[model samples]
Target: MKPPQFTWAQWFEIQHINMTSPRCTNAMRVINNYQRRCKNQNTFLRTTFADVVNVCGNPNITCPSNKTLKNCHHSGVQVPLIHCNLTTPSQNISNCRYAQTPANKFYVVACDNRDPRDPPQYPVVPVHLDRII
Candidate 1:
């Protein structure tokens, strides 16, 4: 798989903001507390696995309904990628997973070739800002 292309300046700024934020720090603290309670427990593994499945949008060729939770989707749905292809932002967006609807376009797939990643790029409504503010 190809790695994402991002400039060094962009990555550094994002890292700086994340390290400086109090709210993010607090959230991490809470996660640590939870981890301590669940360490070495079966519930811990089950819970963690469920979270992983939700993020990938269950992109397996098989429909999500068909596969078992563990074998199927991990990473439920990705947030759409944002930004104008024309301009680069100073920092990378909070999480690279926001979902965006393709710009006023529809996709059609033949029975033989159907890949979720094939969705065409076009303008879409901006939802990531809602999460940032």
Candidate 2:
């Protein structure tokens, strides 16, 4: 199935929060990796500023307003630490900040064109969980 298309406003809503969080760098890294792959395949899946908004659609997702996007600040260095007890039998106290893995949920997008002789394959875009942030 094709991924949902988004308007500028919708895209902003999805990304503004990520842009300001520590996940921003990782998110961009993943996004760029996808773009690089799309470029190699010579497909429209390569994301553009305009396409960012319309590329992914989910009923549960809502975009942020322009004002919010404009006011968003980058706090990418602030790592969220989890307090853990490291003592024997889990008694020691320590602060841990581990790398976050991407969620399994993704915005899937199919190619606009496909080979007649081969099975179709689509690209899956990673949607960070920060949409709620």
Q: What's the true lDDT of residue 77 in model 2?
A: 23
Model 1 weakest 10-residue run by lDDT: 124-133
Report, for every candidate in turn, its global Cα lDDT versus the true structure.
Answer: 0.23, 0.27
lDDT of 1 by residue, 5-93 (tens): 42222221232112222333222222223223211111011122123223223343332443332222222333222121212222323
Give per-model TM-scores: 0.19, 0.19
lDDT of 1 at 56: 28
Model 2 agreement with the true structure over 24-72: per-residue lDDT tens digits: 2333333233223211111111233234323432222222333222222
How many clashing residue pairs are found in candidate 2? 7
RMSD of each: 18.2, 16.4
